[PDB]
Design a protein around this ligand. Structure first.
Ligand SMILES: [Cl-]
Ligand SMILES: [Cl-]
Ligand SMILES: [Cl-]
Length: 129
Protein backbone atom coordinates (compact mmCIF):
# COMPACT_ATOMS: atom_id res chain seq x y z
CA UNK A 1 0.00 0.00 0.00
CA UNK A 2 1.26 3.47 -0.81
CA UNK A 3 -0.12 5.81 1.85
CA UNK A 4 -1.02 9.40 1.37
CA UNK A 5 0.90 11.79 3.59
CA UNK A 6 -2.02 12.75 5.87
CA UNK A 7 -3.42 9.22 5.69
CA UNK A 8 -0.15 7.87 7.11
CA UNK A 9 0.02 10.60 9.76
CA UNK A 10 -3.45 9.58 10.94
CA UNK A 11 -2.57 5.88 10.98
CA UNK A 12 0.61 6.56 12.94
CA UNK A 13 -1.34 8.67 15.46
CA UNK A 14 -3.98 5.94 15.72
CA UNK A 15 -1.21 3.53 16.72
CA UNK A 16 0.30 5.82 19.35
CA UNK A 17 3.41 6.98 17.49
CA UNK A 18 2.65 10.67 17.82
CA UNK A 19 5.12 12.08 20.36
CA UNK A 20 6.35 8.59 21.18
CA UNK A 21 9.68 8.92 23.05
CA UNK A 22 9.30 12.66 22.46
CA UNK A 23 9.26 12.45 18.66
CA UNK A 24 6.47 14.47 17.10
CA UNK A 25 4.31 13.01 14.37
CA UNK A 26 6.09 15.03 11.68
CA UNK A 27 9.35 13.28 12.55
CA UNK A 28 7.78 9.88 11.90
CA UNK A 29 6.11 10.98 8.67
CA UNK A 30 9.36 12.54 7.43
CA UNK A 31 11.25 9.36 8.25
CA UNK A 32 8.73 7.25 6.38
CA UNK A 33 8.84 9.61 3.39
CA UNK A 34 12.56 9.20 2.92
CA UNK A 35 12.79 5.54 3.96
CA UNK A 36 10.00 4.18 1.77
CA UNK A 37 8.17 7.03 0.03
CA UNK A 38 5.16 5.86 2.08
CA UNK A 39 5.14 2.41 0.42
CA UNK A 40 4.55 -0.46 2.85
CA UNK A 41 6.00 -2.95 0.36
CA UNK A 42 9.41 -1.25 0.14
CA UNK A 43 12.43 -3.54 0.58
CA UNK A 44 16.13 -2.81 0.26
CA UNK A 45 19.15 -5.10 0.48
CA UNK A 46 22.11 -3.89 2.58
CA UNK A 47 25.78 -4.50 1.90
CA UNK A 48 26.03 -6.75 4.97
CA UNK A 49 23.34 -9.05 3.55
CA UNK A 50 20.54 -7.86 5.82
CA UNK A 51 17.37 -6.35 4.34
CA UNK A 52 15.21 -3.34 5.30
CA UNK A 53 11.45 -3.80 5.22
CA UNK A 54 8.36 -1.64 5.07
CA UNK A 55 7.36 1.97 5.56
CA UNK A 56 10.13 2.57 8.08
CA UNK A 57 12.72 0.25 6.47
CA UNK A 58 13.25 -1.85 9.58
CA UNK A 59 16.37 -4.00 9.36
CA UNK A 60 16.65 -7.80 9.61
CA UNK A 61 20.05 -7.66 11.33
CA UNK A 62 18.32 -6.87 14.63
CA UNK A 63 14.60 -6.50 14.46
CA UNK A 64 12.83 -9.15 12.40
CA UNK A 65 13.34 -12.63 10.97
CA UNK A 66 13.76 -13.23 7.25
CA UNK A 67 15.66 -16.52 7.39
CA UNK A 68 18.56 -15.20 5.33
CA UNK A 69 20.52 -12.83 7.55
CA UNK A 70 23.23 -14.94 9.23
CA UNK A 71 23.97 -14.17 12.86
CA UNK A 72 21.03 -11.78 13.15
CA UNK A 73 18.42 -11.26 15.84
CA UNK A 74 14.63 -10.90 15.76
CA UNK A 75 14.02 -8.49 18.66
CA UNK A 76 10.52 -7.49 17.52
CA UNK A 77 9.61 -11.20 17.35
CA UNK A 78 8.05 -11.00 13.89
CA UNK A 79 8.66 -12.26 10.38
CA UNK A 80 10.03 -9.40 8.29
CA UNK A 81 7.12 -9.96 5.91
CA UNK A 82 4.78 -8.60 8.59
CA UNK A 83 6.45 -5.23 8.02
CA UNK A 84 5.13 -5.15 4.42
CA UNK A 85 1.43 -5.31 5.30
CA UNK A 86 -1.08 -2.61 4.36
CA UNK A 87 -1.82 -2.56 8.11
CA UNK A 88 1.06 -0.67 9.76
CA UNK A 89 0.56 -2.16 13.23
CA UNK A 90 3.63 -4.42 13.13
CA UNK A 91 5.86 -1.64 11.76
CA UNK A 92 4.68 0.80 14.42
CA UNK A 93 5.10 -1.63 17.32
CA UNK A 94 8.57 -2.53 16.17
CA UNK A 95 9.50 1.12 15.60
CA UNK A 96 8.54 1.79 19.23
CA UNK A 97 11.10 -0.78 20.34
CA UNK A 98 13.76 0.56 17.98
CA UNK A 99 13.39 4.20 19.03
CA UNK A 100 13.59 3.14 22.69
CA UNK A 101 16.90 1.28 22.14
CA UNK A 102 19.19 4.18 23.13
CA UNK A 103 19.84 6.43 20.13
CA UNK A 104 16.31 7.60 19.52
CA UNK A 105 15.44 8.22 15.90
CA UNK A 106 19.12 8.27 14.93
CA UNK A 107 18.54 4.54 14.40
CA UNK A 108 17.09 5.65 11.07
CA UNK A 109 20.14 7.07 9.26
CA UNK A 110 17.81 8.78 6.76
CA UNK A 111 15.97 10.51 9.61
CA UNK A 112 19.30 11.77 10.89
CA UNK A 113 20.43 12.90 7.44
CA UNK A 114 17.19 14.32 6.03
CA UNK A 115 14.72 15.05 8.86
CA UNK A 116 16.63 15.80 12.04
CA UNK A 117 16.71 19.53 12.73
CA UNK A 118 14.35 20.43 9.87
CA UNK A 119 10.82 21.84 9.93
CA UNK A 120 9.25 18.40 10.33
CA UNK A 121 5.84 19.88 11.16
CA UNK A 122 5.53 20.61 7.44
CA UNK A 123 4.90 16.86 7.00
CA UNK A 124 1.62 17.02 8.91
CA UNK A 125 0.58 20.53 7.83
CA UNK A 126 -3.01 20.68 6.66
CA UNK A 127 -3.78 17.21 7.98
CA UNK A 128 -7.01 16.61 9.85
CA UNK A 129 -5.56 14.82 12.87
CL1 LIG B 1 5.45 17.59 13.93
CL1 LIG C 1 18.23 -15.19 9.55
CL1 LIG D 1 20.50 9.20 4.14
Amino acid sequence: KVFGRCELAAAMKRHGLDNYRGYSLGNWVCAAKFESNFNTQATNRNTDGSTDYGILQINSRWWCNDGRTPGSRNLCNIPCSALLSSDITASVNCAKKIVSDGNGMNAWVAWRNRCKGTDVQAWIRGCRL
